[PDB]
Amino acid sequence: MVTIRLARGGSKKRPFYHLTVTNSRNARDGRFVERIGFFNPVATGGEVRLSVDQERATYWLGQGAQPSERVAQLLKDAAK
Amino acid sequence: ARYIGPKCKLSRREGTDLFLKSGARALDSKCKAENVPGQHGQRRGRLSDYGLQLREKQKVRRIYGVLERQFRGYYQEASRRKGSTGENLLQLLECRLDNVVYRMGFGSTRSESRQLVSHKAITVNGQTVNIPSYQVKAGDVVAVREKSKNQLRIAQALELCGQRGRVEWVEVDLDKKAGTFKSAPARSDLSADINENLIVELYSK
Amino acid sequence: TVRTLTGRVVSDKMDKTVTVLIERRVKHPIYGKYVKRSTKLHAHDESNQCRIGDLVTIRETRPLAKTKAWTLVDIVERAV
Amino acid sequence: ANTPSAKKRAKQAEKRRSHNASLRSMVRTYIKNVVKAIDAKDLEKAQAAFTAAVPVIDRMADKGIIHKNKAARHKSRLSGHIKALST
RNA sequence: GAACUGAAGAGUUUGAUCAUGGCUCAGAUUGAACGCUGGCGGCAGGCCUAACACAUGCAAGUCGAGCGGAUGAAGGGAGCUUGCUCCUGGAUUCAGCGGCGGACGGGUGAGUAAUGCCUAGGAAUCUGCCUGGUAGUGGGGGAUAACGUCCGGAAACGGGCGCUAAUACCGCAUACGUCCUGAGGGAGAAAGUGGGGGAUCUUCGGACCUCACGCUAUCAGAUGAGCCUAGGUCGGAUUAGCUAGUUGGUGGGGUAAAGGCCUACCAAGGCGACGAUCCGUAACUGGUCUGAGAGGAUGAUCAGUCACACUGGAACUGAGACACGGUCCAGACUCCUACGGGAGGCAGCAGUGGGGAAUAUUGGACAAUGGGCGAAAGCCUGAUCCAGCCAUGCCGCGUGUGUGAAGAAGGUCUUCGGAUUGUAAAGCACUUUAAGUUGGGAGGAAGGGCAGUAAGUUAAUACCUUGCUGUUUUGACGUUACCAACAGAAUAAGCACCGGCUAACUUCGUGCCAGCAGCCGCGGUAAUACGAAGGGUGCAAGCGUUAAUCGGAAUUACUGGGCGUAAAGCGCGCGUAGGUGGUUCAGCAAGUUGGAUGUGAAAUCCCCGGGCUCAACCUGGGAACUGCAUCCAAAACUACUGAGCUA
RNA sequence: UUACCACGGAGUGAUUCAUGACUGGGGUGAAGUCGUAACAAGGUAGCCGUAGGGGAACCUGCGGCUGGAUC
C-alpha cells in the first residue's frame, strides 16, 4: 500500500511534519517516493501552517494512496 | 561569561581611552594611563607585527566586552556577508542591544547597558529582550520597560551621553526614554583610531 | 532507438559466438590524458559469418549464455 | 522466549506442509506417468495419462500449490512431446 | 538579483652566506580520553574495544461482526420469603480452530574486493494489502481440535478411544477474463458474516431486498522485489599464470523469469601486465573533516542499499523468508532432571558481569505521528514521543552596576626616594538576568461517544456512509514553554603560559643536582627557560595534555618540484606493446563545442527569507550535485576514411 | 533405499605468527686497547670495479676516472 502520511521533521517539543507519499512498510522518517507538502502545527508569524500542493495530492489519491487519519483531516482543512 | 575586573589596566595596556568608565572624569585623573599595568610599566620595547594585530584585536573586544568565540563567529558572519570583511565586521558588533543602548545613552558605560539590558529593563519593538547580543535591525525601536522608567541610572546617563558626542544614526526621545535605530553606521560614523584591517590579517594566521 | 556498439573482433574459435573488442577512451581523473581501454564482449552469432579482424556491431540483448548478452547487428567491414 | 502466536503458526504450517506435500506429490506423479509414457514411446496411453494429467495440474495450480506459470509450462512441453511423438 | 570573496610563515646544518634538504611549531577538527576547575538553559551526541557471555523486566499481537464450547450478568417467574436454592434470559470475556500480521518496524557491521555498493541502461518476471475495470460468489461431501474419558511422562508433553463447527479442507456445476492446444478443442475457482427492512413464502432458524465487510477469475496502475548489461569501487607483482561445468553449441530438465541454473552428448574453449589468480585489509554510497582550489583523510549521528542474527547447514508455510524475538538436524556453552530426557540464544529497549583510556535509567505513556489487527469501539507497539545521567560538543546567559585616593592595610620589587598590586579594595549609592519561593499560564488535540439535522443509497421515512449543530470526554511529558510578585549582591572563577618561535618579567631557593622540554635548547653559585612568590599575558565554565586527519608541505609538484657537482640520465644500441607524429583537399562526427530532454533520492554544503526573546536549532524556495545516457546543431584542432605533396 | 550435503576424520603440502642453544652483522653509548686509513702532494695522490692477502683501518696487482698537489 502506498500511503500519504506525516513525517516528523522538526525538533524537540517543536514538531514539524512533511506530508509524504510513501509505501506503508517504510519507516515514518525513512524512505519515501515523494514529498508533496508540509504542515506546521506551531506556526507563529510568516510560517505557512499548511501547504498541500493540491495537484500531486490528487494524482497519488487517484493511484490508490490511503491518507492517514491526520492527513485526511488536513486535506479537508486545506480545501475548506 | 564576561570580564569582571579593574578597567584602567585594559586601557593602560594599550594606551587608548577605552570607554569602560563614565565620562564624569578624564582617565588621566583616575589612572596612570601613560604606563602599562603591572610592576614593569616604565619599560620600553617595540611590539612585534603579530602583537600589534593582537592588541588591535583586543581593543575591539574590550571596548564592546565581547569574547572572541562570538567575535570569530562575528568575523565568520562578516566574512560570510558580501562586501568588505573590514566594515562588515564593526557593524555586526555595533548592532548589539547593549551597545545600541549605550549609543542611546541609557547607560553611562556598556557595562551599565549590559546589566540594564540583561535585567529585562529594555524592550525592543515592544518585546522584552534580556540578552546583550541581540542584533537590532534598521527601523527597530528600543525602549526601557515602564517599571524601569524612573531609574536614576538612565536618568544620569542620558545627560552624560550629551557630553560624549551625539551619534547621528540613532535618535532618542528624552521624555519617552525610547529611541529608534535608523540604519547601521558606516566607517566614517565610527572612530578612526581603530584599524579593522588588522582584524582580518590576524585571523588569517 | 537502440544503442549499438562497434568494435574490432578478436576471437572466433567458438560455436555460434564471436568475441569483439570494444575501444574506449576515458580521461584519467587527475592527469586528464586519454588512455585507450579495452572491453572484450562475448557476442552471439546465430549463424557464423564473422572471421577474425572484422569490424562488426552488437546490441545489448537477451542473456543467452553465461557470458553472452550481446548479439550481432551486421558486418560493417570484412577483413578480406 | 516463545510467544503463543508463534507456536500456533508452527503448528499451522506443519499441518499445511503435510497437506501440501500430498497434493504436490499428486501433481508430480501424474506428469511422471506421462513422461514415462513418452519415454516408452507408447502413444495410445500417452494422452490417456496426459488427459488425466491436465485436470490435476491446474486443480493445484489454482490452489497455489505449483503456481499457474509452472503448470502452463508443463502442459506445453508435455503436449509438444506427445505432438512430436505423433508423427 | 544570490548561490562567492580566494592562498602569510617561523626555528633548526655554518666562523658567517646562498641553495638543497629533512625535523619541529603556529591552524581547523573529533562519537574523543586524562589532569585542574566548575553556575544555568536550549539543541544535539553518548561501548569507537569483546559479532564477548548474558540474571531480571518488557520489545507482536489482534479479530466474537468467520467458527465451535465454557464462563455464564442485567432483566423477569418460583420453594423459603427471597438468608439459601430452582427455571427464562443472553450482556460480557475467555482457553482453541480459523484470518491477518509476525518477511514491517528495531539492532549490528562479523562476513563480503564483488551474486555487494554507485552511475546509466535493458527485459523475462513475480507483487499481499490499496485503486480503477470486468465476470461471479451455485450446489454437496469427508474430517479434526476445543470437549469427555483412558494411558504413559518428573517435566517438556505425547499417544489412543468417541463428538462437533467454520470465511478450515476437498469434490461437483459454471468461465467476462485466464491456461495449454494439431487453434478444431480441452482445463481451471469461490464463502460467507453483520445491520435493517415494505411485500411473498417458510422447517419459524429463516428464505427475499438493500447496505457494508468479504472471497473467486482476470486486466491495468501503484508500490515492492527478482534478473541482465557497460563503466567505477583499498594495498601488495618480493603474488604471473588461472579456470574442465571450466568456455561455447545441441536436446532435455528446472525457475515466477533468461542463463551451465542442472544434466546428457559434441568441440577445446574462457580470463589475464588494460593485473587475472593469490595474500592482507575492508560493509558501500549520500555524505563528514581539512584545503584557496586541485586534492588528501574518512564512512559516527541521519538517509538509501547490502549482509548478518550463538556456530554450520537445510528446507516448510507464505504474495513476499530460506525468516532476530518461526521449524528441523549437527556443534560449543548455560540451566532443569526422577538419568529416561528436556530448555535457551539481548548485534530489540533498560540493565549486569567482563574487556577497555572511554560512552548513560532495570523510567513514563501510547497524548502526537506511524505500524499491525479490527466494521467500529478498542488492544499491542522499549517504533515513536518524552523524561533520568554525563561541560561530550555547538550556542546563549550569569557570577554584578556607577562613584570612589586613603592612591587605606598587607604582599612584591626597590635605586630605599619610591613604584606595583591599585578605583583595584574599604566606603557611598544602585539594579538584581540567572538560581530560590509564591502566583498565574498557552500550545503540541487531530479525535471519540451520544443526540439531532441535511445529503447519498434503496422499494423504504429503516440500516449504513458523508457534511454540520449541541453536550460530555482524550496531554505521557509537565509540577509545561511563557508571565507576574518577594527577598537580598546577596548563590556563582578557574585553567594554561611569560627566552625565541608566541602576547606577556622581576625577586627568592637550588646549583649540569633538582628538574623543564613541540624545536632551538636552559640549569655546573647573580637562571626573565628549574621550584616558589608577586606582577602580567591569553582563555574563561571552561582551561591544557595526549591520540588521530588535513593544512602549513611547492616535502609525490595535474594545478605545482627536480636529475653536470646537493638524491636522481639505465653502460650502450636495436626493438615489441604503448605514447606522439610534417603538409594540402574532401568526407564523417568518436573526441571537442553549444543547446534541449531524462536522470543525478531526501538530508547536508551554499544563496535569499521565515519561526523559536537572539543564537545553536528547525524550516520555505532557489542554487548545486562539476556525472551519465539520448537527441539536435557546428566542423578550427585531434581520431577515422579517401585522394594527394615533398620539408 | 539411492543422489546431494553439514559435522567429524585421514594423509600430504603452503603460508603466517611467536619462540630457539648458538651464530652474523648494525646502531647508540660517560670513555678503554692497537694503530693512524682519509682530509695539505695527509707525508706511498685519492676514488671506482675486480682479484688476492693481512689483527684493523687497510695493502698489492689489473683496468678506469679527476671528484689530484707542484709544474
H or E segment to which residue A4 belongs: strand A2-8
Q: How far is CA C10 from the centre of its chain?
A: 9
Q: How far is the CA of A57 from the C1' of E209 (A)?
A: 39
Measured in angstroms, the resolution is 2.5
Is residue C59 within 8 A of residue C47, CB to CB? The reply is no
State the distance between the two ends of chain D, measured CA to CA, in whole angstroms.
65
Phi, psi at B58, each rounded to 5°: -75, -20
Given a contact as 3+ CB pairs under 8 Å, which chains touch C?
Answer: none
Compute the distance between CA of residue C42 and CA of residue C24 in angstroms, rounded to an integer: 17
Residue C18: half-sphere exposure toward Cβ, Cα within 13 Å: 27
Given a contact as 3+ CB pairs under 8 Å, which chains touch B?
Answer: none
Instruction: Identify the residue whose cell numbers are 509524504.
Output: A20
Compute the distance between CA of residue D55 and CA of residue D58 in angstroms, rounded to an integer: 6
How many angstroms separate the Cα of D34 from the Cα of each of C74, D3, D31, D40, D68?
A: 44, 47, 5, 10, 19
Number of H helices, E strands in chain A: 2, 4
Is residue D78 within 8 A of residue D50, CB to CB? The reply is yes
**Which nucleotide's C1' atom has the smallest distance to the CA of A73?**
E446
Annotate chain C with DSSP letters as a single string.
---EEEEEEEE--SSSEEEEEEEEEEEPTTT--EEEEEEEEEEE-SS----TT-EEEEEEEEEEETTEEEEEEEEEE---
- List beta partners, residue C24: C37
Instruction: Identify the residue whose cell numbers are 482543512.
Output: A77
Compute the distance between CA of residue D67 and CA of residue D18 in angstroms, rounded to an integer: 18
Q: How far is the CA of B55 from the C1' of E559 (A)?
A: 38
> What positions of strand E are covered by protein, i.e. any atom < 7 Å from a CB?
4-8, 26-27, 39, 42-44, 60-62, 96-102, 104-106, 121-126, 128-131, 169-172, 178-182, 186-189, 216-218, 221-224, 227-232, 247-250, 252-261, 266-274, 294-296, 302-305, 316-319, 323, 325-327, 343-345, 368-372, 383-387, 395-405, 407, 412-413, 419-425, 430-434, 443-447, 467-468, 477-478, 483-485, 489, 493, 501-506, 534-541, 558, 578-580, 590-592, 601-602, 606-614, 617-620, 629-630
Structure determination method: cryo-EM
Q: Indicate if the alpha-carbon torsion angle D1, D6, D7, D11 is positive or negative.
A: negative
Of B100, B96, B144, B147, the residue nearest B123 (C-alpha): B144
Compute the distance between CA of residue B75 and CA of residue B66 in angstroms, rounded to an integer: 12
Classify residue A25 as exposed, middle or buried by CB count within 10 Å of its CB (0-12, 13-18, 19+): exposed
What lies within 8 Å, CB to CB, of D62 at 6+ separation is D68
